Design an enzyme around this catalytic site. Structure first.
Site, PDB file in Angstrom:
ATOM      1  N   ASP A 289       0.713  -1.068   0.067  1.00 43.68           N
ATOM      2  CA  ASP A 289       0.119  -0.047   0.150  1.00 43.68           C
ATOM      3  C   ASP A 289       1.061   1.199   0.027  1.00 43.68           C
ATOM      4  OD1 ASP A 289      -2.495   1.677   0.077  1.00 43.68           O
ATOM      5  OD2 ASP A 289      -3.332   0.247   1.586  1.00 43.68           O
ATOM      6  N   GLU A 495     -10.403   6.313   4.668  1.00 44.22           N
ATOM      7  CA  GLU A 495      -9.220   5.930   5.388  1.00 44.22           C
ATOM      8  C   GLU A 495      -9.637   6.423   6.706  1.00 44.22           C
ATOM      9  OE1 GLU A 495      -5.613   5.052   3.258  1.00 44.22           O
ATOM     10  OE2 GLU A 495      -6.765   5.667   1.509  1.00 44.22           O
TER      11      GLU A 495
END
Ligand SMILES: *[C@@H]1O[C@H](CO)[C@@H](O)[C@H](O)[C@H]1NC(C)=O
Ligand SMILES: *[C@@H]1O[C@H](CO)[C@@H](O)[C@H](O)[C@H]1NC(C)=O
Ligand SMILES: *[C@@H]1O[C@H](CO)[C@@H](O)[C@H](O)[C@H]1NC(C)=O
Length: 606
Positions: A289, A495
């Site tokens: 990521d 997020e």
């Protein structure tokens, strides 16, 4: 096989494994490490791509060539980067990745589909396959070959800011929705070997099962945090859908920022190499990521040399750096030259990256197809998004008492109706995060149809539609309205910004519902990424619909409100009574939901 300058890896008639081995055997260490490096478009230039032999580019959320850019502008940007990569000694094309997680959502004018929580409510894996098919076309309309989807997280606590990216708290529903993968990539052949990567060709994209593994199981739903669960629980809840992804030939897997029992996933050799590669037999590539390797350490980035060693030795193949590429390449090269990382590890990472690039046809079709630009925002895909939005809606209430008339469906012909609330005419709010900007945004951010515009397109020509964002009770009582539609809910987030311990919607929202419903019968449309405190909204409302984050096609909401279709969605998550119950899942001694998993009322079409 014929010309005097014949090179086997350039021969499109040869098997993929032969082309991979031929190319790998020719590469320098700089060329190998370059393949393992993915950089952001914001740090890329022709010279950087050539000189560093870069393997991949991405746009992060909101990273676009300009605001309002056309599909052709995106193709020209991607082609300009590809021409630099094709000009290296070996001519290895780059792959360009992007978060196309509910359509091609960074791009102006792309169809925006409902987010995954609402797709889970549909219980319709073929609908989700069709969404993958349309998404691949709209991503290829912009010249991009690789989508970071599906998120197959099993969100076990809705306080997580990524709960909306999970199809369900029930892993069986998540497993069923792995049908996104053959939508994006194409169906695998009958004799296909589980774990092999697959993409059908230039009208499909590489997919990405993410985030491996246990991203939906973190303590208190804290994003990027620790998932505390025994191996049985990891394997029974968080892992199964990865096996379904192997069976469907997912081309890549992205590692989670999260940890499992205190071990960072980006440094977990047992799970990335021991399980994903060596047990599930995954043969595509494993990607980090964004700054995932930096976040192995506390503080993040405090020992980048360690981050490189730990992640590459754990088995990651490609690093989403995405900015400090010169440091990444220098450190990895130093580790290999020092004997800290063996060449066998580098060769395995490059083998996997090349395998995906050859398999998907990237060496044969490295450039964009200008004839695909027209697929962006196509009406057929909007009709699909409208179908999905309507199927995602969960009817939670349809009358205040057991003897009241059902409010829904509403008649299309009435003298005057009210549409109200902060979410009734706000396309950015109905799309949520990962739309145009990383965190989403407010207002008319792209092409679509708000709830108010959908009402105006639905009702009889004699029906007068009044809009008021936040009317007071006196205005409503005096207006001569037949009924009101009031839409409120969460603001866009993505997020960590979405982590939320109180799960109470911003005001004015409840106040507007109370003012409107106090004056006329009302249907409340709740826009949210997750269950939120709802008893006060329910108490005020005649009918209440959980619409999730339905995307650009607000007519999917009105298709059910006015009875063109019956309500059919069912909750894909538990609706809690209070946040002090959380986490609360089926089987728990304290399971006491306001609405259970699978709950939903129905209507019949008029
Ligand atoms: C969990 O969150 C705490 C509080 O912010 C942080 O200090 C800790 O590093 C996190 N743990 C993990 C494993 O990410
Ligand atoms: C709930 O939490 C969110 C996200 O942390 C915050 O922005 C909001 O102000 C909180 N609402 C409260 C405390 O009522
Ligand atoms: C819808 O139609 C069926 C008959 O097909 C009926 O049994 C059902 O009660 C109807 N209405 C609702 C609200 O379910």
């Amino acid at each position: 096989h014929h010309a005097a300058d014949y090179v086997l890896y350039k021969d499109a008639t040869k098997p993929v494994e032969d082309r991979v081995a031929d190319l790998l055997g020719r590469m320098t260490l700089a060329e190998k490490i370059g393949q393992m490096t993915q950089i952001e478009r914001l740090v890329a230039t022709p010279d950087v791509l050539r000189d560093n032999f870069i393997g991949s580019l991405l746009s992060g959320g909101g990273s676009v060539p300009r605001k309002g850019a056309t599909a052709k502008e995106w193709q020209d940007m991607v082609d300009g980067f590809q021409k630099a990569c094709m000009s290296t000694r070996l001519g290895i094309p780059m792959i360009y990745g992007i978060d196309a997680v509910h359509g091609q959502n960074n791009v102006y004018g792309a169809t925006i589909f409902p987010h995954n929580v609402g797709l889970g409510a549909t219980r319709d894996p073929y609908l989700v396959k069709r969404i993958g098919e349309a998404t691949a076309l709209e991503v290829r309309a912009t010249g991009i070959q690789y989508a970071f989807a599906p998120c197959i997280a099993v969100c076990r606590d809705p306080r997580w800011g990524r709960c909306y990216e999970s199809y369900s708290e029930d892993r069986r529903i998540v497993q069923s929705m792995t049908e996104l993968i053959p939508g994006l990539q194409g169906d695998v052949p009958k004799d296909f070997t589980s774990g092999m990567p697959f993409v059908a060709g230039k009208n499909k994209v590489a997919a990405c099962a993410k985030h491996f593994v246990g991203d939906g199981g973190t303590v208190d739903g804290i994003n990027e945090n620790n998932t505390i669960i025994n191996r049985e629980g990891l394997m029974n809840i968080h892992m199964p859908a990865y096996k379904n992804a192997m069976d469907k030939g997912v081309s890549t897997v992205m590692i989670s920022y999260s940890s499992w029992n205190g071990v960072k996933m980006h440094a977990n050799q047992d799970l990335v190499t021991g399980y994903l590669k060596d047990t599930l037999k995954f043969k595509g590539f494993v990607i980090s990521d964004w700054e995932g390797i930096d976040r192995i350490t506390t503080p993040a980035g405090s020992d980048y040399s360690y981050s490189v060693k730990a992640s590459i030795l754990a088995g990651l193949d490609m690093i989403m750096v995405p900015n400090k590429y010169q440091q990444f390449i220098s450190i990895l090269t130093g580790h290999v030259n020092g004997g800290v990382i063996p060449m066998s590890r580098i060769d395995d990472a490059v083998t996997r990256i090349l395998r995906v690039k050859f398999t998907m046809g990237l060496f044969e079709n490295p450039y964009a197809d200008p004839a695909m630009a027209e697929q962006l925002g196509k009406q057929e895909h909007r009709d699909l998004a409208r179908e999905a939005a309507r199927k995602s809606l969960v009817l939670l209430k349809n009358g205040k008492t057991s003897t009241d008339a059902p409010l829904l469906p509403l008649p299309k012909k009435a003298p005057k109706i009210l549409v109200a609330g902060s979410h009734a005419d706000n396309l950015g709010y109905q799309c949520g995060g990962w739309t145009i900007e990383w965190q989403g945004d407010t207002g008319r951010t792209t092409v679509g149809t708000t709830i108010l515009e959908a009402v105006k397109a639905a009702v009889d020509p004699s029906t007068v539609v009044v809009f008021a964002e936040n009317p007071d009770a006196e205005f409503v009582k005096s207006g001569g309205f037949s009924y009101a539609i009031v839409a409120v809910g969460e603001h866009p987030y993505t997020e960590t910004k979405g982590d939320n311990l109180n799960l109470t919607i911003p005001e004015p929202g409840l106040s507007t519902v109370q003012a409107v419903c106090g004056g006329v019968r009302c249907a409340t449309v709740l826009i949210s990424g997750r269950p939120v405190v709802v008893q006060p909204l329910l108490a005020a409302s005649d009918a209440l619909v959980a619409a999730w984050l339905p995307g650009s096609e607000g007519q999917g909401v009105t298709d059910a409100l006015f009875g063109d279709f019956g309500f059919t969605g069912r909750l894909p998550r538990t609706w809690f009574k209070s946040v002090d119950q959380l986490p609360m899942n089926v089987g728990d001694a304290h399971y006491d939901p306001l609405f259970r998993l699978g709950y939903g009322l129905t209507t019949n079409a008029t």
